[PDB]
Amino acid sequence: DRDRLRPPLDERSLRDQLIGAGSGWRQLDVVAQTGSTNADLLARAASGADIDGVVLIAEHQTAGRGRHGRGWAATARAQIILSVGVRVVDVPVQAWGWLSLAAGLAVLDSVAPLIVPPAETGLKWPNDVLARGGKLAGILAEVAQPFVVLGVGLNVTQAPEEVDPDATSLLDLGVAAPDRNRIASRLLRELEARIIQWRNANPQLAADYRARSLTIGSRVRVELPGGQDVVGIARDIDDQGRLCLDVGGRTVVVSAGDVVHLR
């Protein structure tokens, strides 16, 4: 079935394209299986390793992490499962929130042309990559000074029945034979540019995010950490990467939470 549409990644090829002159990526490894690529890179940094510009890709992830203590389901060779290390200590802490937003924009730009784009194809705050209403990719940013580990889970041929009822994949969107080697290459290249833009506070980063946001201008219900709900209209993203809500004339700024686009 879908397994035949899932050939293995070419580590040697990815290294030839992404490592060398003109590229910031220093190290790239493809492992057959791990618990969590985010956990692994955090473990490396915890033992003194310099993970800046280091890429770890897993064909399969058995104990995937999600935001707010949730999980991330996956089957072998059905997704692009990677984590990258980013040195952030040179950047003010108030701007670290934009790093995760930049990541989702990069993931989206890497797969957007492969799709015609149906309704609801863009970014849901924080960095949910949505397509036709379904969650195409999820991003997780975890802190390990002086680094931030950026995690990306992109559904390539992953069936929604195998992971989550609200999930979608490139295959379920119409992409017949998605090449994970091509996509991963474009992903990390888009990611490199966005990280550089974030590090230098490039205005275009925020501009490109707004142009691809599905949340801004929509009536939403935001489920805050702690279990409280806030209903209003998303208006803008501030300089810290936080969602600014219009609640009956009052401005409510949210740093973290789950966004639901309402009727």
Ligand X SMILES: Nc1ncnc2c1ncn2COCCNS(=O)(=O)NC(=O)CCCC[C@@H]1SC[C@@H]2NC(=O)N[C@@H]21
46 vs 207, which CB is nearer to ligand X?
A: 46
**CB-wise, 90 or 150, nearer to ligand X?**
150
Angle of helix 203-210 relative to helix 180-199, nearest 10 degrees?
130
Please report whether residue 73 would count as binding ligand X according to CB under 6 A. yes
Please identify which residue in 153, 178, 232, 241 interacts with ligand X, judged by CB under 6 A: 153
8 vs 92, which CB is nearer to ligand X?
A: 8
Q: Within 13 Å of residue 48, how many CA atoms lie on the same side as its CB?
A: 0
Q: What's the chain's length in residues? A: 263
CA distance 152 to 57: 10
Q: What are 67's two structure tokens?
A: 């935001």
Q: Is residue 17 involved in binding ligand X (CB under 6 A)? A: no
Residue 133 binding ligand X, by CB under 6 A:
no
With CB under 6 A as the rule, give the number of residues binding ligand X. 27
Nearest CA-CA partner of 149 in 71, 239, 52: 52
Position 215 contacts ligand X (CB under 6 A): no
Least separation, in Å, of the C-beta of 231 and ligand X? 20
Q: Is 157 an interacting residue with respect to ligand X (CB under 6 A)?
A: no
Residue 138 in the binding site for ligand X (CB under 6 A): yes
Which is it for the CA torsion 32, 35, 36, 37, positive or negative?
negative
196 to 19, 25, 96, 182, 202: CA distances (angstroms): 16, 12, 13, 22, 8
Residues at the contact surface with ligand X, assessed by CB under 6 A: 36-38, 61, 64-68, 70, 72-74, 81, 83, 135, 138-140, 151-153, 155, 158, 163-164, 167
